[PDB]
Each structure stands twice: as C-alpha cells, then as structure tokens.
Design a protein around this ligand. Structure first.
Ligand code: NA
Ligand code: NA
Length: 127
C-alpha cells in the first residue's frame, strides 16, 4: 500500500516537509493543499499515471483528471489544490489503467472548529 502526505501552503518542496497520513483529514479553505503520493512499488516516468479529484454532492462526482509524471527516484507524484470550495473530496491515484489508491479529505470555512466525534454536514455550523 502507498502513502499520502500533505502540507498546507500560504500563497502570500521536499519529501520531508509532508505529513504522512490518510485519516481525519480536515483542511481550511484559505491555504493551498499540497499532497505527495509515494507508490508502494517502483514506477516508470513514462507509465500512464493520473489523479482525479471528486467533490461530494449526491455522492462523489468527478471534477476532472490530471496526468502526472512520477519521479522514479523518490517513487512519488505531487500536486496541489488552490481555492477548493468547502466540502468533502475524494482523491484517486491511477497507474497503468487501474485505480490503485484513494483518500478522502474535508475543506472547511475558516470559522468554528470541526469536532471529530459530533460534527455532521446537517448541523447549524456545517450547513
Ligand atoms: Na452523484
Ligand atoms: Na491544482
């Protein structure tokens, strides 16, 4: 299994700067969300690699896909998302035709914290 890592950037990069995790990802809407993906196997710079991002509405809907060129030494791809609207997102990684990994994250308006155990999309703060 591969690994996702993240760093938040103020508009106003090295592998060690990223925080490696795929759980409880909650990002603000005023920082650029930068990710790295480290493949569990070795990869070729010429192999067809894509990411897609989907936004949750009535279930996830694909926003678009983007061709990525792997770094074959670090075995990574990297990207970033500027200006996503608040919501729930699904990032998928495809290699040579197959989806090989995916991860969810939330984007929230910078106003009132998200309580991990009690928050829901249908409460006064999130809605
Ligand atoms: Na749908
Ligand atoms: Na982008």
């Amino acid at each position: 299994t591969g690994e996702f890592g993240w760093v938040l950037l103020d508009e106003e990069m090295t592998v060690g700067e990223y925080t490696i995790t795929r759980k409880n990802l909650i990002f603000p809407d005023d920082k650029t969300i930068c990710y790295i993906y480290r493949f569990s196997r070795s990869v070729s710079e010429s192999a067809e690699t894509y990411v897609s991002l989907s936004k949750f509405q009535l279930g996830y809907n694909e926003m678009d896909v983007l061709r990525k060129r792997p770094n074959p030494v670090s075995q990574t791809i990297e990207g970033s998302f500027q200006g996503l609207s608040p919501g729930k997102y699904l990032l998928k990684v495809a290699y040579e035709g197959d989806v090989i990994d995916e991860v969810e994250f939330l984007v929230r308006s910078t106003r009132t914290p998200y309580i991990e155990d009690t928050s829901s999309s249908a409460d006064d703060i999130e809605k």
